[PDB]
């Protein structure tokens, strides 16, 4: 692989591939710059030799496009595909172009470790903005379930706000039509939301206490008390007793209003630091 | 455990007497049901769930059944309904899927025919064509619906003596589909599974291969078997090509391959 250095055409864009930003399973992510305009992007390149992988990749692209437009989701810019024979890999090649963020949230959190625990207001804004993204997913008809919510996948935008970008594990119901009860487009069964709520509860716990919860709230904590009932309500062992994302977001708004915080605003205490 | 036989279940205007069990398994049981007000008979599938992942898979199955209904080789969807965990007698979410009642499972009828010797090429042709036509309807959707569990044991025979597909519990597709229609997304594995069915109908064993060296009866099918069972998925025929070849075979045998499979229907 030396995709770095190449130029890639996507519609009217001519993108110089500047460097690698991230790698792993299906895919690598690069920094790219459009020659005509100077605009900068993240370019994800996913390779497939197999029809099951084709389906998963195309599904990811559809979710990115569907969810784009929310302020806490990365913006979808464009996508393209190269057939196996016409590609330089001898594989199907998929190119997904999105907004370039400042970097991964955890890189900015590392910088704070030497200084001290995060303020409750910083936690509040990170977690609110994350939960707002998840809300936008769960409110779709039918709901889109993320299934892989983790702190290490969250991005910080250039404006200092959280962005979700990893829809490779997401799922929903296809061909949803937009005494027992006849099934209506007005259905009220959970279809995966509750596991996203649990995963978010783990994020909250980790943001406050800086340890992973499964290996209870630390008995001597008095700094993050404001979040204790939410943590307990999201980490209920029985999925059906967990809050919905609407209730989670409502509670975080109440908390923000009571703390004089606009929870949508830039997380400036991270944005003073370096992570990408 | 079927306390359910003998109950009456209301689904809108239907009042369905649950007459007996037809089929069972992990997810679900299937019952014969009869509407009191009309005398109409149905298959009633009852799917129980204690978890959200299963709720999703169930509702997905219902959505596929409803989307595919209307094709002559797909069981007809009639209605669906749910009972919440608390209001249900199981202490679980209960889903009820009501469809057309078929005559029975295809393999039951094939068993009866064993006594009479190998199936004629015409019978194989009609069974296989009608199966492939159902799969074609799936693969032609935009985006394609992939079945993923095609097997001879799951095929039904209708009351008119035609093949019906009914098991969409393993199916998948792409949601929120908008540059992409050239990529296979699972069709080739359905093709392989269908090739196994054709082989099994002719030679009465599952290929897993090799076409039996001494066969001269089913020669007309040999290349289609080989073309569907290619080791490399991308070298396998599409379902459109498969159907085209079966139609040519039919026309050369003077057979309307959509018509009732009468030789099964007298069993």
Please describe what this structure looks like:
Two copies of one chain form a homodimer. Chain A has 276 residues and is α+β, with helices and mostly antiparallel strands. Chain A folds into two domains: 7-102, 2-Layer Sandwich (Phosphorylase Kinase, domain 1); 103-276, Transferase(Phosphotransferase) domain 1 (Transferase(Phosphotransferase), domain 1, Orthogonal Bundle), CATH 1.10.510. Chain A has seven helices and ten strands. A six-stranded antiparallel sheet of chain A has the order 1-2-3-4-6-5, with helices on one face. A three-stranded antiparallel sheet of chain A has the order 7-8-9. In chain A, α3 (120-138) packs antiparallel against α4, α3 runs antiparallel to α6 and α4 runs antiparallel to α5 (228-234). The longest helix of chain A has 19 residues, at 120-138. Chain A is globular and about 60 Å long. At the A-B interface, α1, β5, β10 and α4 of A face β1, α1, β5, β6 and α4 of B. β10 of chain A pairs antiparallel with β5 of chain B, so a sheet runs across the interface. Chain A: Belongs to the protein kinase superfamily. Ser/Thr protein kinase family. Chain A: GO terms for molecular function: ATP binding; clathrin binding; cyclin binding; protein serine kinase activity; protein serine/threonine kinase activity; protein-folding chaperone binding. Chain A: One of its GO terms (cellular component) is cytosol.
